[PDB]
Design a protein around this ligand. Structure first.
Ligand SMILES: Nc1ncnc2c1ncn2[C@@H]1O[C@H](COP(=O)(O)OP(=O)(O)OP(O)(O)=S)[C@@H](O)[C@H]1O
Ligand SMILES: Nc1ncnc2c1ncn2[C@@H]1O[C@H](COP(=O)(O)OP(=O)(O)OP(O)(O)=S)[C@@H](O)[C@H]1O
Ligand SMILES: Nc1ncnc2c1ncn2[C@@H]1O[C@H](COP(=O)(O)OP(=O)(O)OP(O)(O)=S)[C@@H](O)[C@H]1O
Lengths: 97, 260, 347, 337, 217
């Protein structure tokens, strides 16, 4: 009763950013915040496959705050890889037997 | 005197005189009949005496004791109104079935702000009955805790409720009502006496066994003999067969064996 | 002279002297009053008669024509002074908690009377205890016995005594009783059956969602919030545990909590001899049978049972009380009691 | 009779009832008013007033007959709003330290980095939402102003927003401030709307907050903290790196923060030094610091019963019997090994 | 309440009870009830008191609400048809046939109409052949917001009923109204309270000369 023909006509999906759409969103996060240009977003996007925006947004913010840890003025692909290789919203493990 | 509605003018509010609101709304009356239709259910009447006339008849016998008088008996049980009204009616002076019970949301609380105004009346009207039925409830319960603790005109007056008990069980504390007396329905002896009673005035086909009628009543609720008389007369419109068919209409369901 | 000064102070007054609650201390010889319907102008306030003695939110004398502040209200009294402003001690019949007495002692009197320990061991006095259980087992009874067993003038405050539907009369009684607790003495403001927020309503009362809600807000802000304890013992005991707002379940508001079972055989015989003493006992009757059968005697059955047993007997004017009279007394008192199987079916 | 005739001489004026405002129109202000409770009044003021000193949501003076606005007053005034622990729940400490000090101290780790200075926290959690703010008070500078969202549950329209401006500008006067809003669970994170016509002072107040917190003279040398027990009901307006941008959380520490708080409250009172805590720590299954503080209180109760000065681990043993067995819930553990 | 000669405290309907004087010529034995007094606006000077007021919103409908029906016209309910016919139309007017067997003065009765019935139709047939002060109502009209609305409704109904003539009146709603299940503390605490209270207190056991034999179905 909610989608037939006059209420919500079109129903198009939001596919997961495929491989470099993720990196696109990521550099959208990774543009204003000053970056050391030695950052190839290709490796980043590749080494974290099936990674939705939020994760990538959490990746770039993590990298920003990582360069903030040392107090840097730039963003190194090291910190970018750190965000890529962060918890990625994955845990933990125990690992318990 | 304090708390006195007196003569005042909206003109300049210079108090003028002193005047002495809903008294009669509760204070307003059944001079009923006798026990002629009770016939064997008289032990409960004896208890009525023991617990009601004791706050009435001889205060000099338990004030000599020195211990407080009773307030409530919870004259509950199988639904009692009729005879519980008509019996101490014979006193015709203390039976004041004010009872506040009809208007649950208007006469009670919202006008019985503190029912002590009615307690005031009782202090003027020691011959007055207090029937009752079902936090306003708990509020008036606190009012009871203040009053009926051996403290009234006749010190206990008549502070009783009756129903037929799963409300707020706070009242169930005996310190709020002493006795708790169900109404055992009439049985073979009582049922037969009331059989002769309810068959008294109707010009029946006289000379008829009423014992089998009393028995066919499995502890009928008192006036059911009258109703069977009504069912009988209707068939005749009174032989024993009349009352037989009367109970047959009355008693059927119970029916439907094949489950023994 | 002085008589002329008083005559002039009366000249300032209008014959119909309305009443209006002050809103705020604004002392340009005019205030912002609030009469029974809230007449809030910049009405003058009589200067010589004390204009600033009364606080905001306090009743004052008001005019009719301009509703000017006529003066400080008369000495008003709440209907609970005789119960609160108090003009049986430890135990007249020892045979109950025999312990919660001592614990409420250590929680109320010992802190209040000798508060030289909370700096002796870096501690804090118990700002609140709750005591609860069945409808009469030793909760409020202990408080009643603690009222006499103390070096201070205890105060009795029925939890429902604070239920008056007048505008702010809830907060008004809070203010009054608290000005007492703080500006009368170190007192014992005992308030019982305070669990009245949960599952019922009244006919002699308006919508409590917006009538006693701000009332309870005032009461809470007063007791254990702002204008804090100091040494103001106002402890809140109860009967239930459930229906309450957890805005105070958290500590600070009230710290400790205590329950009440029903008394045991050792205490059953105790309160028996306490109550069975009120009658020339036919010693052939078996208290222990009553004690084990009625093994859950909160404290009302014992009293009621023995009083009604005396009534049963002295109906016949007998001195002794045969066992059957005790049976009848208790079973009248003890309705709806079936403790057999289950269980009922063992040993 | 020191002034018994001046009061009879002030008489020439009797005007300006309470007369609260509602809103205002255009092409002329036409402020809208209710006097006390009677009705809505789209008034036109007495032109001898200011077209803006009658800010809607104020009890202003207003004619008794024509209801034109007159000399106002807010007789509702200010009385409405009420650290060695540095190192607690471990991970929380670093993120808190960064978000507080690094913008307050070095806008270089981010500005030059282009990232923004972490200036907000979405905290969720016996966790210690205040104790963290106080460990920050050790570090912000020396400023700590408690404003609990519970007291912030007020029933006057704009009075909440007015307190918003009050606190926001009192903070901007000082520096390195702390403003601790809690019970945002009770305040609300998702913009629940009901036709009850009730909790909308929260609406205007929170939009005013959005306006005045960060951006439009941001907190800067000030920390205004709104946090929850749970990030359950968020809003796309709060995840902004300008408003709250750390999202720390903590819960029951295992035993180490536990033992630490044990010792904290111990030295905070007359205790025996020869006692240990890891033993007591094992005793502690799951508890907040206040519960533990309650253990300390019960030890004090024993030391009030018996004349103790250095509260011994036997006093604490009885206190543990209480808190964890006689207060674990009631007593219902024993009679089976 | 009255204080002195032709002067009484009298409840208002405006919002302020007053203690006013009355026209003395009024029979002194008529100012006892809270009946429909009448006074001047400003003077509030009692001129006279009126017995009736505030009808029960159906007031028997007073015209020819009689569906103009005879016995067999009902859609086939011969059991109830005969029963109601000879046990109502004769007993509703009689004094001696019941007494010719001392039967009793009668009281309420009951019907129940399932699918493919007409139990209500029988009621309307009798409503035709009845020719006295019968008022029709529905118990559903007793459930509102404030206190005792429907309770006071049925109360004043009883009053005006025993007042006009103890002949006949009927109401038609039983389900979700006459609810024996007093036992659920979830919904209709005061609502079902006042509902079933009015029901039983108006049962009165009975009243034996009023509103003879309301039915429901
Ligand atoms: N020292 C005692 N210990 C325990 N019980 C006692 C003691 N002394 C007397 N009692 C009994 O305990 C009862 C005390 O009941 P209360 O708690 O005062 O009743 P209550 O406070 O009205 O209860 P509620 O919840 O308000 S209905 C009395 O009826 C005594 O018989
Ligand atoms: N992590 C901690 N470090 C030091 N003291 C603590 C800690 N946790 C609790 N306490 C102490 O125990 C008491 C508990 O108070 P709070 O932690 O403020 O209570 P709370 O209910 O957790 O507060 P909220 O709801 O999170 S604002 C405080 O008075 C502290 O002194
Ligand atoms: N034989 C019929 N001829 C015409 N209409 C009929 C007939 N029987 C029933 N009806 C309709 O049903 C109504 C009267 O019958 P009722 O006794 O009220 O029915 P019922 O037993 O209440 O069944 P419900 O209420 O519809 S489930 C009238 O409004 C008619 O329209």
């Amino acid at each position: 009763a909610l989608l037939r023909s006059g209420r919500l006509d079109r129903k198009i999906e939001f596919p997961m950013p495929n491989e470099e759409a993720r990196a696109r969103i990521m550099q959208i996060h990774s543009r204003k915040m000053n970056v050391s240009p030695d950052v190839n977003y290709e490796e980043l996007a590749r080494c974290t496959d099936d990674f939705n925006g939020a994760q990538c947004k959490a990746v770039c913010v993590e990298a920003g705050m990582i360069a903030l840890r040392r107090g840097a003025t730039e963003l190194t692909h090291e910190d970018y890889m750190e965000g890529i290789l962060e918890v990625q919203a994955k845990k933990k493990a125990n690992l318990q037997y | 005197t304090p708390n006195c509605r007196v003569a005042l003018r909206n003109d300049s509010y210079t108090l003028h005189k002193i005047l002495p609101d809903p008294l009669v709304s509760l204070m307003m009356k059944v001079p009923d009949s006798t026990y002629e239709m009770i016939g064997g259910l008289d032990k409960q009447i004896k208890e009525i005496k023991e617990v009601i006339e004791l706050p009435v008849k001889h205060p000099e016998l338990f004030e000599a004791l020195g211990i407080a008088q009773p307030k409530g008996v919870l004259l509950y049980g199988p639904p009692k109104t009729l005879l519980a009204r008509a019996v101490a009616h014979h006193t015709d002076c203390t039976f004041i079935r004010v009872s506040g019970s009809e208007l649950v949301q208007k006469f009670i609380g919202e006008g019985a702000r503190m029912v002590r105004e009615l307690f005031v009346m009782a202090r003027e009207h020691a011959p007055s009955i207090i029937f009752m039925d079902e936090s306003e409830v708990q509020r008036t319960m606190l009012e009871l805790l203040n009053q009926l603790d051996g403290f009234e005109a006749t010190k206990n007056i008549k502070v009783i409720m009756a129903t037929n008990d799963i409300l707020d069980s706070a009242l169930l504390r005996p310190g709020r009502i002493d006795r708790k007396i169900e109404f055992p329905p009439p049985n073979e002896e009582a049922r037969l006496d009331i059989l002769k009673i309810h068959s008294r005035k109707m010009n029946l086909t006289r000379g008829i066994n009423l014992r089998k009628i009393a028995e066919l009543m499995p502890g009928a609720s008192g006036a059911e003999v009258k109703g069977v008389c009504t069912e009988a007369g209707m068939y005749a419109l009174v032989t024993q067969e009349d009352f037989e068919m009367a109970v047959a209409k009355v008693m059927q369901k119970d029916s439907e064996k094949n489950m023994s | 002279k002085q008589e002329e000064e008083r005559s002039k102070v009366d000249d300032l007054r209008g014959t119909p002297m309305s009443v209006g609650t002050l809103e705020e201390i604004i002392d340009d010889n005019h205030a912002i009053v609030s009469t029974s319907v809230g007449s809030e102008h910049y009405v003058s306030i009589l200067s010589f008669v004390d204009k600033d003695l009364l606080e905001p939110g306090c009743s004052v004398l008001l005019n009719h024509k301009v509703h000017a502040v006529i003066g400080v209200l008369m000495d008003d009294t709440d209907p609970l002074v005789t119960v609160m402003k108090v003009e049986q001690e430890t135990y007249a019949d020892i045979g109950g908690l025999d312990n919660q007495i001592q614990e409420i002692k250590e929680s109320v009197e010992l802190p209040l009377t000798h508060p030289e320990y909370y700096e002796e061991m870096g501690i804090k006095p118990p700002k609140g205890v709750i005591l609860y259980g069945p409808p009469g087992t030793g909760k409020t009874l202990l408080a009643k016995a603690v009222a006499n067993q103390t070096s201070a003038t205890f105060l009795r405050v029925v939890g429902s005594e604070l239920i008056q539907k007048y505008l702010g009369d809830g907060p008004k009684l809070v203010r009054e009783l608290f000005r007492v607790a703080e500006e009368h003495a170190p007192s014992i403001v005992f308030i019982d059956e305070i669990d009245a927020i949960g599952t019922k309503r009244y006919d002699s009362n308006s919508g409590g969602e917006r009538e006693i809600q701000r009332t309870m807000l005032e009461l809470l802000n007063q007791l254990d919030g702002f204008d804090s304890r100091g040494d103001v013992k106002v402890i809140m005991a109860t009967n239930r545990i459930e229906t309450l707002d957890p805005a105070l379940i958290r500590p600070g508001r009230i710290d400790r909590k205590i329950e009440f079972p029903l008394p045991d055989e050792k205490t059953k015989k105790r309160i028996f001899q306490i109550h069975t003493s009120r009658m020339t006992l036919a010693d052939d009757v078996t208290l222990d049978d009553l004690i084990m059968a009625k093994d859950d005697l909160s404290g009302a059955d014992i009293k009621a049972i023995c009083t009604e047993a005396g009534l049963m007997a002295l109906r016949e004017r007998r001195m002794k009380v045969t066992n059957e009279d005790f049976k009848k007394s208790k079973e009248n008192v003890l309705y709806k009691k079936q403790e057999g199987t289950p269980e009922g079916l063992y040993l | 009779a020191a002034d018994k005739q001046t009061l009879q001489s002030e008489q020439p004026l009797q005007v300006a009832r309470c007369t609260k405002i509602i809103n205002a129109d255009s092409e002329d202000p036409k402020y809208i008013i209710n006097v006390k409770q009677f009705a809505k009044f789209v008034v036109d003021l007495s032109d001898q007033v200011a077209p803006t000193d009658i800010e809607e949501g104020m009890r202003v003076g207003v004619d008794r007959n024509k209801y034109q606005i007159h000399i106002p007053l807010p007789p509702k005034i200010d009385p409405t709003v009420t650290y060695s622990d540095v190192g607690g729940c471990k991970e929380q400490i670093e993120k808190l330290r960064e978000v507080v000090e690094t913008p307050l101290l070095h806008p270089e780790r981010f500005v030059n980095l282009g990232i923004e200075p972490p200036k907000g926290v979405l905290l969720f959690g016996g966790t210690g939402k205040t104790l963290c703010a106080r460990a920050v008070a050790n570090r912000t500078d020396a400023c700590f102003i408690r404003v609990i969202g519970s007291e912030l549950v007020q029933k006057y329209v704009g009075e909440g927003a007015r307190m918003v401006r009050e606190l926001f500008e009192m903070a901007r006067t000082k520096k390195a401030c702390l403003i601790f809003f809690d019970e945002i669970d009770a305040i609300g994170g998702a913009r629940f709307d009901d036709g009850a016509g009730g909790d909308n002072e929260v609406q205007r107040t929170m939009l005013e907050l959005i306006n005045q917190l960060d951006g439009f003279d941001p907190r800067g040398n000030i920390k205004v903290l709104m946090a929850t027990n749970r990030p359950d009901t968020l809003d796309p307006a709060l995840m902004r790196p300008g408003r709250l941008d750390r999202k720390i959380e903590f819960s029951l520490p295992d035993l180490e923060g536990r033992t630490h708080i044990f010792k904290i409250h111990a030295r905070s009172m007359s205790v025996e030094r020869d006692i240990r805590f890891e033993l007591l720590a094992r005793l502690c299954p799951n508890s907040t610091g206040a519960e533990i503080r309650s253990v300390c209180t019960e030890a004090g109760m024993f030391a009030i019963r018996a004349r103790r000065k250095i509260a011994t681990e036997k006093d604490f043993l009885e206190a543990v019997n209480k808190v964890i067995k006689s207060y674990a819930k009631f007593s219902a553990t024993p009679r089976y090994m | 309440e009255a204080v002195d000669q032709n002067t009484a405290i009298v409840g208002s309907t405006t919002g302020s009870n007053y203690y006013v004087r009355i026209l003395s010529t009024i029979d002194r034995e008529l100012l006892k009830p809270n009946a429909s007094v009448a006074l001047h606006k400003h003077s509030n000077a009692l001129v006279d008191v009126l017995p009736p007021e505030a009808d029960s919103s159906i007031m028997m409908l007073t015209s020819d609400q009689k569906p103009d029906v005879m016995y067999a016209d009902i859609g086939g309910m011969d059991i109830q048809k005969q029963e109601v016919r000879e046990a109502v139309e004769l007993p509703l007017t009689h004094f001696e046939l019941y007494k010719q067997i001392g039967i009793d003065p009668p009281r309420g009765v009951l019907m129940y109409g399932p699918p493919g019935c007409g139990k209500t139709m029988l009621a309307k047939a009798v409503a035709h052949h009845t020719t006295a002060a019968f008022i029709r109502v529905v118990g559903s009209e007793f459930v509102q917001k404030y206190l005792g609305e429907g309770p006071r409704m049925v109360r004043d109904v009883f009053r005006l009923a025993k007042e006009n003539a103890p002949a006949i009146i009927f109401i038609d709603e039983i389900d979700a109204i006459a609810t024996k299940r007093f036992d659920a503390q979830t919904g209709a605490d005061r609502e079902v309270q006042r509902i079933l209270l009015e029901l039983l207190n108006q049962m009165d056991g009975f009243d034996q000369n009023v509103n003879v034999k309301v039915i429901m179905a």
